[PDB]
């Protein structure tokens, strides 16, 4: 008496640790396999409040399930990083990790030691990164035709794919518009708005922003063209000093005299705004009810208490500087928009700031018939925005449809040849694992994976076509590049690296100690 | 509104059914894996009443665990059939079954259909039986030297290992003595008696039986040389009729006349026993206290209320007929023993009937320091009795130490060459499965399974020594036949056939429906 | 998925199984360590009913604590076998076993594999058996001087050692009297009776038996010298036919005719008894009130309803034959005793049958002041009866005081030198293990075990004195054989073999599966 | 497996809906019937 390790504790050692980690990995991957590719299927997730999510999106599915198992959670990180770094290929990354674990089990069940597997996987992964660089094709950041294929490939298999061609052109225009002066893409600069409507086809690109506000006074113009826009973050209210101040009145004449001073300085603020030439104003803080009246009189459209996020989008869009002192307001701080207009959209009043010339932020207004139909269109739009952004930044793409995984697998087996000993088993195992992609694409399409894999391999053999993959509709193997099925290099480099690193980490584990 | 299938029911379909059966199978196999071979280790099982079994014995371990899982139950019956048909090779069969399941999982994960693996397994199993027949060596039913190697191979890797030479010779003598006219061996004719003592080495063969009795009267001899043994199925008591009969006495003098008539009937019975030449008697029923006296008077040793199963073995051992009517007893119904003796063994009084000339039942008196030590010696002896019995009946043996499994794998792979399509994978998988035996023998011995296998296979390649196996002590691959490591053909044929049949049955399942 | 192995199950694998078995074993040994040798102390065990045992006796201690741990139970079997086969040395067997487990753990902790340990232990144990045969001294079964030292050595260190000279003499006479024709000694032939008294020194050997009965009629003599004893196992009442019988009476004068015939049948039965020459009678069954009168008239002492166990010892002590029909009794069935007397002992009246000439059974009548004092005396008498019996049967003794273990140890190290491989470590460990006895003898005496060990080895080194051991009083090393500290060879051969066998068995275990 | 309409819900259709509304109506009317007119009677209500 008594126990050295805590009594309320579960433990799994050696084969049992390897087993639960590997198993949990595999089951997580099996959960999303069927979502993969053109013939992929969707999941309906219901949470404990009864709120529902319907999606094809790998990382969304994994986040929404309430996975508690520790090894499963390790693999879900693979999807989260894929989502952050690329914005697409989350199912792929996770499915590859799952297969890496499966492949490793057959090695462990041969008494190949875990460190040897981990070593072979590291070597295979590193070789894979070198091979991907030679496999990739270069593209120019302005090649709208290729960018459009990138986007269409991304949206294929989603639901929104009925509206694929129009969506993809919008997306390409949207991303091109926010590329910065170092050639980087901040996807935060593409504002997403989701509004029910007549159909998915009504989705449009707005060169500018939607502000969920109404002008502060009905007397202001509802619409203004070639507007001159003032952006203020100071409140258009009576200015108080920071030092504590109080007025003392002893003469009943000074009563109205202070009142009249306060309303003149208010009228002075408005006159200072009018003076800049502005005819549209967005104030981040509040505007005095009296200033509203004056503004209304001077024919100036104004919205108050605008969230900072919008203020910042407005600046990017119209080219205005957010000014912090009314006194400092200058005509050179004003932004420009073709049209500013208060409109109802699906019974919602909003201020459209649109038709800006070279906007640095833009808005995609996504339409659809129901809330849930729109939700899934928006996820597909995000995938596409992500991959178009990667392509513009990296200027490297690869063919899709599992073509690249097959070329990769084949080259890695060549490389395994020159590896001595057991490590060779692991390198081959890594090679074999990548084929889970072509195999899964075929399965989901109801095709026979084994025989299609034989054809696709033979089309890669010798100096074959690195772009050869299975067309899931025809059933033929085809030049995926020529059919416009393409993906950014970054999808694959990230997915494979993530899969390798997280599985290497899991395979190093020989002991699981769970509390409670 | 109401459910169609019972609501208190768990169901597992497709991949999920396959996964649970395959897993339950693999886990069952790996529990007993470490018991295999010369370097195998034992298990201690404690039941819910606190009783303990420590054993190496595969089927014993599997029954003693109280496995509930349905698929696991299915391959436990592989062990039970092996025990019933052969008496040895119970972990081998189960470990082969688990590996067949593991290799099938690999095939299912490549979308090979279950019915195809089943078809390939059936083909490989059938080829295996054919290859086994040509591999086997013929031996004669009375080749003591080979039977001795058969028994010794069986006892290797148990606690009783230290005394295997003496034990094997005893066992070979024991089994050869009970061989019947059809050349058949009935294990039940070898009575196993377990008694604490000085040493495992004090274990001895008795050509005769041990009866758990004392002679009915201490006036009787407690030792008889060249005994003439009578065996009575009836009570030596006053015989009453089946028809209800009653005595009426009206004359006081008739009292004594009846008492004296009964007393004479008893004396007549004993008189008839004495006349047959019997000087020893075993009675299945009661002996009247009064009859006891007369038997003692006549110098006849007698035991009463002997168990019917004892009477039967006594008859088998001494060559006596169990008689049911004292009047019918003749000298010709008497059996013979060189020595009948009442004596104490480890504190217990028993009657030894021994030195019988050509016993048809025989007794092995197993000695050991403690009860649990003795239990495990008895289990070892049982294995050995089983395989010596198989060899005598079948006249066919194979070399052991995994040499035969490697020969099988190698030949099956050759067979797989000429098999077209997908079924070929299943046949190769079956071939790879059999190597679990040489692999497990090496790993229990702390050796590297992968390199061990490379060497053993090389020794089988071309032509090629079908008997080549790994000596787990030296680490050299040697001729197992020359080293006397041999087992009956029936061990392999039964083990492989049941492993195949049970896993084929499991692989056919696509739906598990579990009530309550 | 469901679980495969049942879920109520605790399981300890590899290092954990070894640890729990090794520990459980060791703790069992350590609880009795302090009882060992002439300076040993006693335990008081209280059970859940409040009943008390106090004792030095190792097996009794282990039986009485209700040990449930599975590995502990296996070691306790060691004590039980020591008790059954030898009757002494139970603490020694268990202490050696515990130390063997302790020494094995040191080899396991430096990575020696368990099968090598057990192989080394099996080798040392076998060697030790053959060394013990050369160490033993020959002794004659009728050498009373040596039997007396054997009994005295046994009694040393127990409550009773104050009375150890008269006791030992009594025990030597008792056991010598019951040696059978084959030269064997059945302990059951020495009846132990325990009765409160003035003192432990009032203990006496009765050449006869003590029967817990009173004579059936006070009109019978209480004393008979030179008795002729009849033993009946049939009642002395009117004999009823086996077949159902009813008297029918139509003449009123027949009422008396039958009644009188029945009391004539009684006189007759008694007169048959007297005709034999019997003046004392022991009946296993009842004795008609009227028979009791007739018997008493004839001056015959009769007890009724005597235990069948009593009848049997009566026959063995007096030479009488238990007779089943009064019609059979004759002068030759009668037993002899110098004295038969009904008398009070501890206020209980009993029948003493004593001063028999050639008793084949005798009675130790153990006296002592309190029940618990007496219980412990009887335990010590049992031990001494066992060892005296062993010496009579075996004619082989060794010196005590740990001298034989030191001799054995020294010789085993020599042997070990010729052992090549890792098994050498195990053989040395076994050798060292045996020294737990001289070391414990000295610890319990408060001496310095390490120092005294150096001295005793030195006296055994060269070709010195195999009989040299430490005198726990004197503090010196001397010839123990000369000091008359001696014990049967059988104590050591059984204790070492049991300890070896049960620990080899535990060391083979790599997996503990405990239900519930 | 799950119900579409809430499971904690009582539903009355066709004749059953008609019968319950008609009945509830008639019963309400007949509670006050006896108050009507010059010879109407009163009610005592206790809360
Ligand atoms: N037209 C097509 N034909 C074949 N494969 C395609 C096609 N379009 C996309 N794919 C493949 O589908 C996979 C991505 O599918 P998706 O369901 O979006 O999963 P992920 O979440 O991993 O991006 C990629 O391997 C891509 O090559
Ligand atoms: N001396 C030996 N060397 C190598 N292998 C052996 C030796 N003796 C037995 N074996 C092998 O051990 C296996 C049987 O071990 P065992 O633990 O009894 O399992 P099972 O319950 O299946 O019979 C067989 O392959 C047999 O050939
Ligand atoms: N006079 C003595 N001097 C030294 N050792 C003795 C003496 N008498 C007995 N012993 C030793 O005591 C040990 C037995 O002690 P005991 O408590 O009876 O244990 P056990 O139940 O194992 O016999 C033996 O090793 C014996 O040699
Ligand atoms: Mg995608
Ligand atoms: Mg076996
Ligand atoms: Mg003792």
PDB file of C-alpha atoms in Angstrom, chain C residues 154-353:
ATOM      1  CA  UNK C 154      11.974 -30.669  15.623  1.00  0.00           C
ATOM      2  CA  UNK C 155      10.548 -29.478  18.928  1.00  0.00           C
ATOM      3  CA  UNK C 156      13.203 -26.806  19.492  1.00  0.00           C
ATOM      4  CA  UNK C 157      11.844 -23.241  19.203  1.00  0.00           C
ATOM      5  CA  UNK C 158       8.272 -23.986  19.849  1.00  0.00           C
ATOM      6  CA  UNK C 159       6.137 -23.683  22.863  1.00  0.00           C
ATOM      7  CA  UNK C 160       6.919 -27.148  24.209  1.00  0.00           C
ATOM      8  CA  UNK C 161      10.664 -27.013  24.046  1.00  0.00           C
ATOM      9  CA  UNK C 162      10.730 -26.934  27.856  1.00  0.00           C
ATOM     10  CA  UNK C 163       9.410 -30.549  27.879  1.00  0.00           C
ATOM     11  CA  UNK C 164      11.434 -31.682  24.867  1.00  0.00           C
ATOM     12  CA  UNK C 165      13.342 -34.615  26.401  1.00  0.00           C
ATOM     13  CA  UNK C 166      10.496 -36.621  27.845  1.00  0.00           C
ATOM     14  CA  UNK C 167       8.332 -35.644  24.908  1.00  0.00           C
ATOM     15  CA  UNK C 168      10.853 -36.784  22.302  1.00  0.00           C
ATOM     16  CA  UNK C 169      11.357 -40.112  24.093  1.00  0.00           C
ATOM     17  CA  UNK C 170       7.603 -40.652  24.203  1.00  0.00           C
ATOM     18  CA  UNK C 171       7.250 -39.824  20.494  1.00  0.00           C
ATOM     19  CA  UNK C 172      10.076 -42.148  19.475  1.00  0.00           C
ATOM     20  CA  UNK C 173       8.367 -44.993  21.375  1.00  0.00           C
ATOM     21  CA  UNK C 174       4.985 -44.056  19.896  1.00  0.00           C
ATOM     22  CA  UNK C 175       6.146 -44.009  16.280  1.00  0.00           C
ATOM     23  CA  UNK C 176       8.375 -47.087  16.715  1.00  0.00           C
ATOM     24  CA  UNK C 177       5.346 -49.024  17.956  1.00  0.00           C
ATOM     25  CA  UNK C 178       3.316 -48.451  14.769  1.00  0.00           C
ATOM     26  CA  UNK C 179       5.940 -49.152  12.089  1.00  0.00           C
ATOM     27  CA  UNK C 180       4.229 -51.594   9.729  1.00  0.00           C
ATOM     28  CA  UNK C 181       5.506 -54.779   8.029  1.00  0.00           C
ATOM     29  CA  UNK C 182       6.907 -52.888   5.044  1.00  0.00           C
ATOM     30  CA  UNK C 183       8.754 -50.549   7.450  1.00  0.00           C
ATOM     31  CA  UNK C 184       6.306 -47.695   6.831  1.00  0.00           C
ATOM     32  CA  UNK C 185       4.826 -45.215   9.287  1.00  0.00           C
ATOM     33  CA  UNK C 186       1.185 -44.141   9.115  1.00  0.00           C
ATOM     34  CA  UNK C 187       0.710 -41.099  11.378  1.00  0.00           C
ATOM     35  CA  UNK C 188      -3.016 -41.841  11.649  1.00  0.00           C
ATOM     36  CA  UNK C 189      -2.115 -44.835  13.797  1.00  0.00           C
ATOM     37  CA  UNK C 190      -0.909 -42.464  16.555  1.00  0.00           C
ATOM     38  CA  UNK C 191      -4.098 -41.096  18.115  1.00  0.00           C
ATOM     39  CA  UNK C 192      -3.769 -37.646  19.617  1.00  0.00           C
ATOM     40  CA  UNK C 193      -5.952 -36.834  22.618  1.00  0.00           C
ATOM     41  CA  UNK C 194      -5.831 -33.410  24.277  1.00  0.00           C
ATOM     42  CA  UNK C 195      -6.950 -32.847  27.854  1.00  0.00           C
ATOM     43  CA  UNK C 196      -6.498 -29.985  30.332  1.00  0.00           C
ATOM     44  CA  UNK C 197      -4.330 -30.966  33.257  1.00  0.00           C
ATOM     45  CA  UNK C 198      -1.709 -29.873  35.768  1.00  0.00           C
ATOM     46  CA  UNK C 199       1.044 -29.417  33.212  1.00  0.00           C
ATOM     47  CA  UNK C 200       2.464 -30.094  29.751  1.00  0.00           C
ATOM     48  CA  UNK C 201       4.732 -32.633  31.485  1.00  0.00           C
ATOM     49  CA  UNK C 202       1.728 -34.839  32.309  1.00  0.00           C
ATOM     50  CA  UNK C 203       1.660 -35.870  28.629  1.00  0.00           C
ATOM     51  CA  UNK C 204       1.919 -39.652  28.271  1.00  0.00           C
ATOM     52  CA  UNK C 205       2.045 -42.445  25.715  1.00  0.00           C
ATOM     53  CA  UNK C 206      -0.775 -44.983  26.046  1.00  0.00           C
ATOM     54  CA  UNK C 207      -0.072 -48.398  24.507  1.00  0.00           C
ATOM     55  CA  UNK C 208      -3.740 -48.688  23.568  1.00  0.00           C
ATOM     56  CA  UNK C 209      -6.613 -46.312  22.865  1.00  0.00           C
ATOM     57  CA  UNK C 210      -8.853 -43.847  24.672  1.00  0.00           C
ATOM     58  CA  UNK C 211     -12.562 -44.234  24.033  1.00  0.00           C
ATOM     59  CA  UNK C 212     -14.973 -41.358  24.784  1.00  0.00           C
ATOM     60  CA  UNK C 213     -17.690 -43.632  26.243  1.00  0.00           C
ATOM     61  CA  UNK C 214     -19.049 -44.917  29.521  1.00  0.00           C
ATOM     62  CA  UNK C 215     -19.971 -48.500  30.233  1.00  0.00           C
ATOM     63  CA  UNK C 216     -23.620 -48.930  29.366  1.00  0.00           C
ATOM     64  CA  UNK C 217     -24.778 -50.184  32.799  1.00  0.00           C
ATOM     65  CA  UNK C 218     -23.366 -49.035  36.147  1.00  0.00           C
ATOM     66  CA  UNK C 219     -23.743 -52.595  37.365  1.00  0.00           C
ATOM     67  CA  UNK C 220     -20.773 -53.531  35.146  1.00  0.00           C
ATOM     68  CA  UNK C 221     -17.189 -53.496  36.465  1.00  0.00           C
ATOM     69  CA  UNK C 222     -15.335 -50.212  35.933  1.00  0.00           C
ATOM     70  CA  UNK C 223     -12.062 -52.075  35.722  1.00  0.00           C
ATOM     71  CA  UNK C 224     -10.854 -55.263  34.076  1.00  0.00           C
ATOM     72  CA  UNK C 225      -7.232 -56.470  34.083  1.00  0.00           C
ATOM     73  CA  UNK C 226      -5.974 -58.903  31.429  1.00  0.00           C
ATOM     74  CA  UNK C 227      -9.036 -58.139  29.300  1.00  0.00           C
ATOM     75  CA  UNK C 228     -10.403 -60.247  26.464  1.00  0.00           C
ATOM     76  CA  UNK C 229     -12.108 -57.792  24.170  1.00  0.00           C
ATOM     77  CA  UNK C 230     -14.984 -58.468  21.765  1.00  0.00           C
ATOM     78  CA  UNK C 231     -15.587 -56.047  18.873  1.00  0.00           C
ATOM     79  CA  UNK C 232     -19.060 -56.105  17.313  1.00  0.00           C
ATOM     80  CA  UNK C 233     -20.252 -53.887  14.471  1.00  0.00           C
ATOM     81  CA  UNK C 234     -23.748 -55.344  14.620  1.00  0.00           C
ATOM     82  CA  UNK C 235     -26.224 -54.226  17.283  1.00  0.00           C
ATOM     83  CA  UNK C 236     -27.220 -56.506  20.112  1.00  0.00           C
ATOM     84  CA  UNK C 237     -30.954 -56.293  19.502  1.00  0.00           C
ATOM     85  CA  UNK C 238     -33.531 -58.623  17.965  1.00  0.00           C
ATOM     86  CA  UNK C 239     -32.462 -59.262  14.374  1.00  0.00           C
ATOM     87  CA  UNK C 240     -34.997 -58.185  11.718  1.00  0.00           C
ATOM     88  CA  UNK C 241     -35.124 -60.123   8.429  1.00  0.00           C
ATOM     89  CA  UNK C 242     -34.208 -58.249   5.231  1.00  0.00           C
ATOM     90  CA  UNK C 243     -37.480 -59.286   3.611  1.00  0.00           C
ATOM     91  CA  UNK C 244     -40.479 -57.629   5.267  1.00  0.00           C
ATOM     92  CA  UNK C 245     -41.968 -59.677   8.088  1.00  0.00           C
ATOM     93  CA  UNK C 246     -45.058 -59.337  10.276  1.00  0.00           C
ATOM     94  CA  UNK C 247     -46.228 -61.515  13.154  1.00  0.00           C
ATOM     95  CA  UNK C 248     -49.949 -62.353  13.095  1.00  0.00           C
ATOM     96  CA  UNK C 249     -51.560 -63.223  16.420  1.00  0.00           C
ATOM     97  CA  UNK C 250     -54.983 -64.866  16.777  1.00  0.00           C
ATOM     98  CA  UNK C 251     -54.444 -66.663  20.091  1.00  0.00           C
ATOM     99  CA  UNK C 252     -54.088 -64.337  23.129  1.00  0.00           C
ATOM    100  CA  UNK C 253     -51.664 -66.932  24.548  1.00  0.00           C
ATOM    101  CA  UNK C 254     -49.317 -66.224  21.624  1.00  0.00           C
ATOM    102  CA  UNK C 255     -48.775 -62.647  22.796  1.00  0.00           C
ATOM    103  CA  UNK C 256     -46.492 -63.893  25.535  1.00  0.00           C
ATOM    104  CA  UNK C 257     -45.038 -66.721  23.441  1.00  0.00           C
ATOM    105  CA  UNK C 258     -43.423 -64.252  21.027  1.00  0.00           C
ATOM    106  CA  UNK C 259     -42.419 -61.700  23.650  1.00  0.00           C
ATOM    107  CA  UNK C 260     -40.551 -64.464  25.471  1.00  0.00           C
ATOM    108  CA  UNK C 261     -38.985 -65.859  22.308  1.00  0.00           C
ATOM    109  CA  UNK C 262     -37.551 -62.388  21.687  1.00  0.00           C
ATOM    110  CA  UNK C 263     -35.998 -62.133  25.137  1.00  0.00           C
ATOM    111  CA  UNK C 264     -34.664 -65.642  24.645  1.00  0.00           C
ATOM    112  CA  UNK C 265     -33.015 -64.480  21.457  1.00  0.00           C
ATOM    113  CA  UNK C 266     -31.410 -61.849  23.666  1.00  0.00           C
ATOM    114  CA  UNK C 267     -30.069 -64.169  26.360  1.00  0.00           C
ATOM    115  CA  UNK C 268     -28.710 -66.343  23.537  1.00  0.00           C
ATOM    116  CA  UNK C 269     -26.823 -63.496  21.893  1.00  0.00           C
ATOM    117  CA  UNK C 270     -25.269 -62.569  25.227  1.00  0.00           C
ATOM    118  CA  UNK C 271     -24.440 -66.191  26.056  1.00  0.00           C
ATOM    119  CA  UNK C 272     -22.640 -66.491  22.711  1.00  0.00           C
ATOM    120  CA  UNK C 273     -20.523 -63.492  23.728  1.00  0.00           C
ATOM    121  CA  UNK C 274     -19.671 -65.041  27.109  1.00  0.00           C
ATOM    122  CA  UNK C 275     -18.883 -68.351  25.419  1.00  0.00           C
ATOM    123  CA  UNK C 276     -16.097 -66.642  23.468  1.00  0.00           C
ATOM    124  CA  UNK C 277     -14.388 -65.808  26.779  1.00  0.00           C
ATOM    125  CA  UNK C 278     -14.918 -62.064  26.326  1.00  0.00           C
ATOM    126  CA  UNK C 279     -15.099 -59.886  29.454  1.00  0.00           C
ATOM    127  CA  UNK C 280     -15.046 -56.548  27.637  1.00  0.00           C
ATOM    128  CA  UNK C 281     -17.203 -55.639  24.636  1.00  0.00           C
ATOM    129  CA  UNK C 282     -17.270 -52.678  22.252  1.00  0.00           C
ATOM    130  CA  UNK C 283     -20.322 -52.390  20.001  1.00  0.00           C
ATOM    131  CA  UNK C 284     -20.536 -50.061  16.999  1.00  0.00           C
ATOM    132  CA  UNK C 285     -24.320 -50.072  17.294  1.00  0.00           C
ATOM    133  CA  UNK C 286     -26.893 -50.280  20.062  1.00  0.00           C
ATOM    134  CA  UNK C 287     -27.478 -52.766  22.861  1.00  0.00           C
ATOM    135  CA  UNK C 288     -31.032 -53.600  23.909  1.00  0.00           C
ATOM    136  CA  UNK C 289     -31.785 -52.470  27.464  1.00  0.00           C
ATOM    137  CA  UNK C 290     -32.380 -56.114  28.342  1.00  0.00           C
ATOM    138  CA  UNK C 291     -29.101 -57.204  26.738  1.00  0.00           C
ATOM    139  CA  UNK C 292     -27.379 -54.606  28.900  1.00  0.00           C
ATOM    140  CA  UNK C 293     -28.846 -56.351  31.935  1.00  0.00           C
ATOM    141  CA  UNK C 294     -27.786 -59.836  30.849  1.00  0.00           C
ATOM    142  CA  UNK C 295     -24.320 -58.585  29.931  1.00  0.00           C
ATOM    143  CA  UNK C 296     -24.018 -56.948  33.338  1.00  0.00           C
ATOM    144  CA  UNK C 297     -25.227 -60.122  35.039  1.00  0.00           C
ATOM    145  CA  UNK C 298     -22.461 -62.049  33.298  1.00  0.00           C
ATOM    146  CA  UNK C 299     -19.975 -59.406  34.442  1.00  0.00           C
ATOM    147  CA  UNK C 300     -19.166 -58.140  30.946  1.00  0.00           C
ATOM    148  CA  UNK C 301     -18.230 -54.497  30.376  1.00  0.00           C
ATOM    149  CA  UNK C 302     -19.993 -53.131  27.291  1.00  0.00           C
ATOM    150  CA  UNK C 303     -19.924 -49.782  25.510  1.00  0.00           C
ATOM    151  CA  UNK C 304     -22.529 -49.097  22.819  1.00  0.00           C
ATOM    152  CA  UNK C 305     -22.643 -46.818  19.774  1.00  0.00           C
ATOM    153  CA  UNK C 306     -18.860 -46.716  19.564  1.00  0.00           C
ATOM    154  CA  UNK C 307     -17.539 -44.631  16.660  1.00  0.00           C
ATOM    155  CA  UNK C 308     -16.444 -46.804  13.751  1.00  0.00           C
ATOM    156  CA  UNK C 309     -13.146 -44.934  13.881  1.00  0.00           C
ATOM    157  CA  UNK C 310     -12.897 -46.107  17.520  1.00  0.00           C
ATOM    158  CA  UNK C 311     -13.668 -49.737  16.660  1.00  0.00           C
ATOM    159  CA  UNK C 312     -10.872 -49.625  14.082  1.00  0.00           C
ATOM    160  CA  UNK C 313      -8.175 -48.338  16.436  1.00  0.00           C
ATOM    161  CA  UNK C 314      -9.447 -50.770  19.069  1.00  0.00           C
ATOM    162  CA  UNK C 315      -8.882 -53.654  16.645  1.00  0.00           C
ATOM    163  CA  UNK C 316      -5.443 -52.337  15.714  1.00  0.00           C
ATOM    164  CA  UNK C 317      -4.353 -51.846  19.335  1.00  0.00           C
ATOM    165  CA  UNK C 318      -5.735 -55.046  20.876  1.00  0.00           C
ATOM    166  CA  UNK C 319      -5.562 -57.527  17.983  1.00  0.00           C
ATOM    167  CA  UNK C 320      -9.301 -58.161  17.953  1.00  0.00           C
ATOM    168  CA  UNK C 321     -11.374 -58.673  14.818  1.00  0.00           C
ATOM    169  CA  UNK C 322     -14.501 -56.584  14.346  1.00  0.00           C
ATOM    170  CA  UNK C 323     -17.200 -59.274  14.052  1.00  0.00           C
ATOM    171  CA  UNK C 324     -20.480 -58.794  12.148  1.00  0.00           C
ATOM    172  CA  UNK C 325     -22.634 -61.662  13.418  1.00  0.00           C
ATOM    173  CA  UNK C 326     -22.708 -62.627  17.088  1.00  0.00           C
ATOM    174  CA  UNK C 327     -23.151 -66.149  15.704  1.00  0.00           C
ATOM    175  CA  UNK C 328     -19.570 -65.891  14.396  1.00  0.00           C
ATOM    176  CA  UNK C 329     -17.678 -64.638  17.448  1.00  0.00           C
ATOM    177  CA  UNK C 330     -14.992 -66.973  18.778  1.00  0.00           C
ATOM    178  CA  UNK C 331     -12.065 -66.953  21.205  1.00  0.00           C
ATOM    179  CA  UNK C 332      -9.798 -66.063  18.279  1.00  0.00           C
ATOM    180  CA  UNK C 333     -11.554 -62.795  17.436  1.00  0.00           C
ATOM    181  CA  UNK C 334     -10.827 -61.484  20.941  1.00  0.00           C
ATOM    182  CA  UNK C 335      -8.281 -58.755  21.629  1.00  0.00           C
ATOM    183  CA  UNK C 336      -6.023 -58.397  24.651  1.00  0.00           C
ATOM    184  CA  UNK C 337      -5.226 -55.449  26.898  1.00  0.00           C
ATOM    185  CA  UNK C 338      -3.433 -55.430  30.233  1.00  0.00           C
ATOM    186  CA  UNK C 339      -6.055 -53.015  31.535  1.00  0.00           C
ATOM    187  CA  UNK C 340      -9.464 -51.700  30.562  1.00  0.00           C
ATOM    188  CA  UNK C 341     -10.829 -49.059  32.918  1.00  0.00           C
ATOM    189  CA  UNK C 342     -13.573 -46.471  32.854  1.00  0.00           C
ATOM    190  CA  UNK C 343     -12.270 -43.389  34.624  1.00  0.00           C
ATOM    191  CA  UNK C 344     -12.493 -39.608  34.921  1.00  0.00           C
ATOM    192  CA  UNK C 345      -9.968 -37.354  33.196  1.00  0.00           C
ATOM    193  CA  UNK C 346     -10.646 -33.614  33.276  1.00  0.00           C
ATOM    194  CA  UNK C 347     -14.000 -34.485  34.859  1.00  0.00           C
ATOM    195  CA  UNK C 348     -14.876 -36.456  31.719  1.00  0.00           C
ATOM    196  CA  UNK C 349     -15.344 -40.199  32.134  1.00  0.00           C
ATOM    197  CA  UNK C 350     -13.704 -42.291  29.418  1.00  0.00           C
ATOM    198  CA  UNK C 351     -12.705 -45.898  28.803  1.00  0.00           C
ATOM    199  CA  UNK C 352      -8.947 -46.510  28.792  1.00  0.00           C
ATOM    200  CA  UNK C 353      -7.806 -49.571  26.898  1.00  0.00           C
TER     201      UNK C 353
END
